Scaffold this active site. Structure first.
Site, PDB file in Angstrom:
ATOM      1  N   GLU E 792       0.825  -1.206   0.000  1.00  0.00           N
ATOM      2  CA  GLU E 792       0.000   0.000   0.000  1.00  0.00           C
ATOM      3  C   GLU E 792       0.863   1.262   0.000  1.00  0.00           C
ATOM      4  O   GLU E 792       0.718   2.144   0.849  1.00  0.00           O
ATOM      5  CB  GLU E 792      -0.963  -0.012   1.189  1.00  0.00           C
ATOM      6  CG  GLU E 792      -2.149   0.920   1.043  1.00  0.00           C
ATOM      7  CD  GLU E 792      -3.125   0.461  -0.024  1.00  0.00           C
ATOM      8  OE1 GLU E 792      -3.201  -0.758  -0.280  1.00  0.00           O
ATOM      9  OE2 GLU E 792      -3.819   1.321  -0.608  1.00  0.00           O
ATOM     10  N   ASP E 793       1.782   1.331  -0.965  1.00  0.00           N
ATOM     11  CA  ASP E 793       2.577   2.516  -1.286  1.00  0.00           C
ATOM     12  C   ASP E 793       3.698   2.791  -0.294  1.00  0.00           C
ATOM     13  O   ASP E 793       4.236   3.900  -0.278  1.00  0.00           O
ATOM     14  CB  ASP E 793       1.698   3.767  -1.404  1.00  0.00           C
ATOM     15  CG  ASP E 793       0.911   3.802  -2.694  1.00  0.00           C
ATOM     16  OD1 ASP E 793       1.519   3.604  -3.766  1.00  0.00           O
ATOM     17  OD2 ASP E 793      -0.315   4.028  -2.640  1.00  0.00           O
ATOM     18  N   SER E 794       4.083   1.823   0.529  1.00  0.00           N
ATOM     19  CA  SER E 794       5.239   1.971   1.398  1.00  0.00           C
ATOM     20  C   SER E 794       6.441   1.278   0.760  1.00  0.00           C
ATOM     21  O   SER E 794       6.316   0.531  -0.214  1.00  0.00           O
ATOM     22  CB  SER E 794       4.941   1.419   2.791  1.00  0.00           C
ATOM     23  OG  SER E 794       4.691   0.028   2.751  1.00  0.00           O
TER      24      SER E 794
END
Ligand code: ZN
Ligand code: ZN
Ligand code: ZN
Lengths: 45, 164, 19, 69, 1180, 56
Positions: E792-794
């Site tokens: 999730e975009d990390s």
């Protein structure tokens, strides 16, 4: 008194609380406080 | 005039008279009255320091030199000459304006700037005769009216000052 | 089917040399 | 601003090759790829360390020192 | 090359682009507009109302006083000095930008004007006109009229004549571009303002609920002489279902809409047939005449010039005209205020009538479904006002005020019997303050947001901010959309994502804005070459003549437009007509429009001519030209100079604006479109368009992008929104904004330790200096699902890489403080206060201050530490919390370091401000090392924070031993379709292996298959996959990882500058609720939406506790008779009373929020009585 | 309402003056004193009221 440095001619001055903030040699109106002469510690990380 | 003096940027009577049309007599009487009032409310109700004194000639020199466009070195020499000019009794009684102007003129010819007295007195609104008259008095004490370091280095020699 | 490189370091030398 | 001491990815010392890299480019007229391999930089992690470095300290040294001794 | 006449290739266009930027730069529009304003506009403004005349009439009281005097003050030439500053003591010296920034001074020069003071006198013999004679008093000196802020790197600035070494001596950055102002030490950039062009007829349709169906509007504007705008509207009343639709025009100062026929008769055309001849230029267009018949019927009862004029006059709003000055009043209105952009002098009614007919004709054409209503978003009808015109109108307004003050002083001196002092008649403060105030704030007056603090976060940020435009959003259009006319003029990708989306635009790389020239020389030229005047134009005797327009003014007609256009174009190309002048020939409409006004946005293009030597159209520029272009480029590092101007003067390139762009055919490339007319399956499908009438050619398609979008690699392999996101995010990346950051005292500054240049770069980036001042690093990136900490975009970062310095940066913060003087008595000083003489001293430590109240540079500081010690005296007879004894005579006014920040003091400078007061600047250094809350992004809209860090032995590794510096999730790729991200990684991998700079410019012949072949030549899998091993166990991962270098950027958002918690803390004075702001130990808002969610949860007690015990909780005493909070409670004496109710035994205490108490008291102030009662009076 | 709202009370004859808590006086440097906007208007009402009293 404390020691300052001119920002254009790099002349080291000694000013008191009564002296005007200005270089007595060239006349600049910006002075840099001289670096402290006590050692400072840094971690190499 | 009081406000300028309190700020250490004091002006002269003529400079203020250039804007506000009041002749000298009323100006002086009002100034004396107001100073008494401020002193009166300073005690019962500070006001003044070494600056409040009228002469304070050293403050005029930087602006007068600026009007003539001289380098800062000449201005500092003029300040030194004016500061030491108060030891001579034949000039000490003169107006602070003349004390500052003649000191400036003395340094103008010391560093050999091509500005004649006809324009120095025309710029600072001072009679040329007064400038040259005062210059003669500021010639018998030249050794005390020039900064020792400047002559020591070699920037200025006292033989560049004409003698009558 | 093409040169995908911005060649600047020595192409100036090549043109300066050609003259 | 100045050449990094180590390669970020693997830590090989690359800060002792900047002047050698520049000298190879200038006097030997080598292409940057050949110079990188001549210096012993084989992994592309080390190649981009020297290949993409911008030497800004040279620009900073053009200003006069703030405090001269 | 070989032949000086061979056709060029697409690679040779970049030599032309290089020449363009060598001559212009990236801030040309800012400097050019300012130079024009200072050089020419300032003189013009003062030569408009230069003369002020005060007439002292006879004043007949005795025959010894019968002379009449006339005093005149006239302004001559204007002079401008170099930048300068006057100190408090009255000494003036030259000011340089570096000192102005440090000392909070305004970088400005002085303005002087020659003033002539004349006095005439005449004998006033009774009942006779006077003969004024000069009375031998004509004084003629320079008068100071204020200070003009100077744009940096302009003709009047000290840095325009400075070399690279000179800039280094002056502590200026050579990479600095200027284009901004320094006001009070702050860099201010003037954002170009977008408006609609004047002196153009526009026909619009109105909605159903309105008696007017169509309206033709023109906002008449005169660029020189008065600057005021008067609008003329021609309305078509009635709808299509009406039996009578007449046309009425709105004239200034008439209060009523007059029939067009009446106006025509007022202009001297009484015959109806002639009026129709002025409107319709075809004698058989009966359909247009049929729609005109009602108009001539409406104004039938008026049949002569004088009656029509009186009809106009009585509608005017003057009511001083009686009945006979009323005809002349209408005549003057029709002369000086009706269609002012043609003329304002007597004897030009024919031009006014013809133009009015032209407006009516266009109105009828649209009403007859022969033309479509004018597009309001057409970029060719818009104008961009730069610093030049903006300062022009500001100066015009201020000079008007100055002249008004001068006369008022003259009148006051004459009446009240005082002496004239020129030093007081002219107040230079008027010009100085008006320009400073308008530039310090954005408030253009005495419009908002016209001036902003220039971004200096990174070099690309500064360049983008210096090329931004703004559009103020009642309008009927969709201005936020990307119009077709925006092509090659504003970047299609760079726009904010918030409420400014589409309203803030960015100029393209090769875009320019004209400064405007005089149209008179062109009008004279047209007259000499057969432009028959409009006073002898009979439409029915020449139904093929072309109407000639210059700046929206119909000057005449031409019988041979083709030759005239050919002559005009040749003149512009050889360099007799300014290249900025736009010439358009609408062949169908039979119109010839020439535009010379300022504000038109244009761009250069190659010129295509037949050149029958080869038999087909080809570019005029050849390889011989390109050879000398690059010869001059490389000789600098001596053949005759050959610059962009040489191309312009030789007719090889041409400036084209959006309006002229409507009449040209442009070829995307000279490679395939110009030549008369297997394929690689990997190349994109290019459409030929097979046209043999090209007139121009694009220099390069890539130049349609802006500064921010020119850093994206392969932007044509990305989805468009991702390009927009990167354009915004690239301005938040740490880099090296300037090379002189060690001599500047900025509020905040971020400097990357080791900036790298991208392995995949762009050719446009060569002119943005992104290789000299880069913002980012080349991290070894793996796209894998390793531990679930990049979901999730990390992202996962290598702790070992961080240890070695990856993405490490310096942070600088400056603190400012002044020694204020509160009048004549109270004054402050920088001091190290003692606890025995100073009150309200902060709980921090003063141990690091010196006797001057400053910490010496090199000392380490932390939270609550005092870095600037200051004290101020206090007034006696004020005791707080006791603790105030005769010993105390000072109070602390010190400046402590920010609570959450720490570091080492880097620099302390002491100086004086404009007023001579002492003030100091203290700068503190600190190093920011990446952690689990820092935001990082690529150049493709892929941003993320660090989820976790791993050491090298925990990361996945290849057989060669290479570990990633960064791991991103595969799930970020598919939905966003950022194919350029993967192409860049493949390209950068090849670039590092071969030692080259990858070419990632958008539209090139480079394909993925070509890069794949290069990668396999180096012994690597062609698609960028590698076999990796698990770091924990050493076993091979069953899948293979896409692995290679990618350019990542450290963004401005770090978690350590956001984390903050509050148990209890300070409250606001008014509402007594937690204060706002993390920096002030503030609380968090439990808003209405949160309240709704907790209501949906049914957590009533939690809702109460949040609103009462976590916030303002206050106890009040209310009266049982009156529900008012008017009970005086002596809680020490256990006494309560509500005077007015005369009770002491019917009191209650309630717990309400202090805001509720505040609300009720405010209602009481409004005479409302909210009576709180503790028992019910009615049943449910 | 006979007891809580009469039309006669929609005309203001005596003005309630809110307490300082509603109109607090802030300090920026604490050598300078500022007053709430309500205090400025209440002073205007008083000055206009006294002017009317003296006039009539
Ligand atoms: Zn100095
Ligand atoms: Zn390595
Ligand atoms: Zn009560």
């Amino acid at each position: 008194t404390l020691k300052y440095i001119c920002a254009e001619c790099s002349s080291k001055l000694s000013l008191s609380r009564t002296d005007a903030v200005r270089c007595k040699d060239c006349g600049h109106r910006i002075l840099l406080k001289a670096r402290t002469k006590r050692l400072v510690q840094f971690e190499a990380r | 005039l009081i406000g300028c003096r309190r700020a250490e940027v004091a002006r002269t009577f003529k400079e203020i008279q250039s804007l506000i049309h009041v002749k000298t007599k009323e100006f002086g009487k009002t100034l004396n009255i107001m100073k008494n009032i401020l002193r009166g409310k300073s005690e019962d109700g500070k006001i003044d320091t070494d600056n409040m004194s009228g002469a304070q000639n050293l403050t005029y020199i930087p602006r007068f030199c600026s009007h003539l466009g001289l380098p800062m070195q000449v201005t500092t020499s003029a300040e030194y000459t004016a500061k030491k000019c108060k030891e001579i009794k034949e000039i000490a009684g003169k107006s602070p304006i003349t004390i500052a102007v003649v000191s400036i003129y003395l340094n103008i010819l010391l560093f050999q700037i091509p500005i004649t007295a006809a324009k120095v007195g025309q710029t600072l609104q001072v009679t040329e005769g007064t400038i040259k008259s005062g210059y003669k008095i500021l010639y018998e004490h030249r050794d005390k009216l020039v900064d020792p370091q400047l002559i020591a280095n070699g920037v200025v020699s006292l033989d560049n000052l004409p003698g009558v | 089917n093409a040169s995908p490189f911005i060649k600047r370091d020595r192409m100036r030398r090549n043109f300066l040399r050609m003259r | 601003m100045i050449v990094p001491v180590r390669c970020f990815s693997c830590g090989k010392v690359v800060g002792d090759k900047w002047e050698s890299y520049l000298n190879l480019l200038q006097e030997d007229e080598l292409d940057e790829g050949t110079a990188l391999s001549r210096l012993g930089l084989k992994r592309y992690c080390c190649r981009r360390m020297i290949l993409t470095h911008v030497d800004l300290i040279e620009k900073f040294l053009r200003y006069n020192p703030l405090e001269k001794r | 090359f070989e032949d000086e006449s061979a056709p060029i290739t697409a690679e040779d266009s970049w030599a032309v682009i290089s020449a363009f930027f060598r001559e212009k730069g990236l801030v040309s529009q800012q400097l050019d507009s300012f130079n024009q304003f200072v050089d020419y506009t300032l003189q013009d403004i003062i030569c408009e109302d230069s003369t002020l005349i005060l007439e002292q009439l006879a004043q007949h009281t005795t025959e010894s006083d019968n002379i009449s005097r006339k005093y005149e003050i006239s302004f001559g030439k204007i002079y401008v000095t170099k930048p300068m500053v006057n100190e408090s003591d009255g000494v003036t010296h030259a000011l340089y930008p570096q000192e102005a920034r440090l000392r909070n001074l305004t970088y400005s020069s002085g303005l002087f004007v020659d003033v002539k003071k004349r006095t005439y006198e005449a004998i006033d013999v009774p009942g006779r006109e006077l003969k004024y004679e000069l009375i031998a008093e004509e004084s003629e000196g320079k008068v100071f009229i204020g200070r003009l802020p100077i744009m940096l790197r302009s003709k009047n600035c000290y840095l325009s004549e400075a070399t690279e070494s000179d800039l280094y001596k002056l502590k200026e950055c050579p990479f600095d571009m200027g284009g901004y102002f320094i006001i009070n030490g702050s860099e201010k950039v003037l954002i170009a303002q977008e408006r609609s062009a004047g002196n153009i007829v526009q026909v619009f349709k109105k909605a159903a609920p309105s008696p007017i169906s169509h309206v033709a509007e023109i906002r008449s504007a005169l660029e020189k002489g008065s600057r005021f705008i008067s609008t003329l509207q021609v309305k078509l009343y009635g709808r299509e279902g009406s039996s009578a639709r007449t046309i009425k025009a709105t004239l200034p100062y008439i209060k009523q809409d007059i029939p067009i026929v009446i106006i025509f008769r007022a202009l001297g055309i009484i015959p109806d047939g002639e009026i129709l001849e002025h409107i319709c230029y075809d004698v058989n267009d009966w359909q247009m005449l049929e729609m005109l018949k009602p108009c001539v019927e409406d104004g039938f009862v008026i049949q002569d010039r004088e009656t029509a004029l009186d009809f106009i006059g009585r509608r005017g709003t003057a009511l001083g005209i009686k009945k006979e000055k009323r005809i002349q009043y209408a005549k003057d209105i029709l002369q000086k205020e009706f269609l002012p952009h043609i003329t304002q002098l007597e004897g030009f009614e024919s031009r006014k009538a013809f133009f009015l007919g032209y407006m009516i004709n266009r109105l009828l054409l649209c009403a007859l479904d022969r033309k479509d209503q004018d597009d309001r978003d057409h970029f060719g009808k818009k104008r961009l006002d730069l610093a030049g015109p903006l300062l022009a109108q500001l100066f015009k307004t201020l000079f008007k005020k100055l002249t008004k003050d001068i006369f008022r002083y003259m009148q006051r001196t004459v009446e009240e019997a005082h002496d004239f002092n020129m030093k007081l008649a002219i107040n230079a403060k008027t010009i100085t303050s008006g320009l400073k105030y308008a530039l310090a704030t954005g408030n253009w007056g005495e419009r908002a947001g016209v001036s902003q603090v220039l971004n200096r976060y990174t070099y690309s940020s500064t360049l983008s901010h210096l090329r931004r435009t703004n559009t103020p959003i009642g309008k009927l259009a969709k201005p936020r959309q990307l119009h077709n006319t925006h092509w090659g003029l504003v970047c299609p990708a760079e726009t904010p994502e918030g409420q400014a989306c589409g309203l803030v635009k960015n100029l393209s790389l090769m875009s320019c804005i004209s400064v405007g020239t005089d149209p008179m020389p062109i009008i004279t030229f047209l007259s000499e070459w057969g432009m028959e005047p409009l006073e002898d134009y009979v439409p029915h005797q020449s139904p093929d003549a072309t109407r000639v327009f210059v700046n929206g003014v119909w000057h005449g007609v031409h019988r041979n437009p083709a030759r005239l256009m050919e002559t005009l174009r040749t003149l512009r190309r050889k360099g007799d007509i300014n290249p900025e002048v736009s010439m358009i020939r609408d062949i169908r409409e039979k119109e010839l429009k020439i535009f010379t006004d300022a504000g038109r946005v244009y761009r250069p293009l190659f010129i295509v001519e037949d050149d029958e030597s080869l038999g087909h159209k080809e570019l005029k520029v050849r390889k011989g030209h390109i050879a000398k272009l690059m010869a001059t480029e490389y000789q600098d590092i001596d053949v005759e100079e050959y610059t962009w101007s040489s191309l312009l003067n030789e007719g090889l390139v041409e400036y084209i604006d959006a309006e002229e762009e409507e009449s040209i055919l442009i070829a995307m490339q000279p490679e395939d479109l110009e030549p008369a007319e297997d394929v690689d399956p990997a190349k994109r499908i290019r459409v030929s368009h097979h046209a043999t009438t090209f007139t121009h050619c694009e220099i390069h398609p890539s130049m349609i992008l802006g500064v921010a979008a020119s850093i994206i690699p392969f932007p044509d392999h990305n989805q468009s929104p991702r390009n927009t996101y990167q354009s915004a995010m690239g301005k938040q990346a740490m880099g090296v904004f300037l090379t002189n950051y060690n001599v500047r005292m900025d509020t905040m500054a971020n400097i990357l330790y080791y900036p790298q240049k991208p392995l995949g770069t762009t050719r446009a980036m060569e002119y943005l200096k992104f290789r000299e001042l880069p913002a980012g690093q080349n991290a070894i990136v793996a796209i894998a699902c390793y531990s679930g900490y990049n979901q999730e975009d990390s992202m996962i970062m290598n702790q070992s890489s961080i240890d070695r310095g990856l993405f490490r940066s310096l942070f600088f913060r400056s603190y400012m403080d002044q020694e204020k003087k509160y009048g004549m008595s109270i004054t402050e000083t920088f001091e190290k206060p003692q606890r025995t003489n100073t009150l309200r001293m902060k709980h921090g430590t003063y141990d690091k201050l010196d006797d001057d109240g400053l910490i010496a540079p090199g000392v380490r500081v932390s939270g609550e530490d005092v870095i600037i010690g200051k004290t101020t005296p206090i007034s006696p007879d004020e005791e707080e919390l006791g603790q105030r004894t005769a010993y105390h005579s000072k109070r602390d006014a010190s400046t402590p370091l920010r609570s959450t920040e720490n570091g080492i003091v880097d620099q302390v400078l002491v100086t004086t401000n404009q007023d001579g007061l002492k003030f100091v600047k203290v700068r503190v250094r600190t190093t920011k090392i990446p952690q689990i809350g820092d935001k990082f992004a690529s150049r493709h809209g892929q941003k993320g924070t660090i989820g976790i860090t791993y050491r090298r032995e925990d990361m996945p590794f290849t057989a060669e031993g290479i570990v990633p510096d960064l791991i991103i999730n595969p799930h970020a790729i598919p939905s966003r379709m950022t194919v350029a991200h993967l192409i860049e990684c493949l390209l950068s991998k090849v670039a590092a292996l071969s030692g080259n700079e990858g070419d990632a410019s958008p539209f090139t012949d480079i394909t993925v298959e070509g890069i794949s072949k290069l990668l396999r030549e180096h012994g690597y899998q062609s698609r960028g996959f590698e076999v990796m091993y698990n770091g924990h166990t050493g076993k091979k991962l069953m899948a293979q990882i896409f692995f290679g270098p990618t350019y990542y950027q450290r963004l401005r958002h770090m978690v350590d500058d956001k984390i903050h918690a509050r148990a209890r803390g300070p409250m606001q004075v008014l509402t007594r609720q937690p204060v706002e702001g993390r920096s002030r130990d503030g609380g968090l808002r439990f808003g209405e939406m949160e309240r709704d969610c907790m209501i949906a949860h049914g957590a009533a007690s939690f809702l109460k506790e949040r609103l009462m015990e976590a916030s303002d909780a206050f106890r009040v005493h209310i009266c049982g008779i009156c529900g008012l909070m008017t009970v005086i409670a002596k809680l020490n004496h256990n006494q309560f009373e509500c005077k007015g109710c005369d009770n002491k035994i019917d009191i209650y205490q309630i717990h309400i929020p202090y805001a509720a108490k505040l609300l009720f008291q405010e209602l009481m102030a409004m005479n409302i009585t909210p009576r709180l009662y503790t028992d019910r009076s009615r049943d449910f | 309402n006979e007891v809580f709202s009469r039309p006669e009370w929609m005309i203001l004859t005596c003005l309630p003056v809110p307490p300082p808590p509603v109109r607090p006086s802030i300090s920026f440097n604490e050598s300078q004193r500022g007053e709430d906007d309500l205090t400025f208007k209440l002073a205007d009402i008083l000055k206009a009221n006294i002017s009317l009293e003296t006039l009539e």
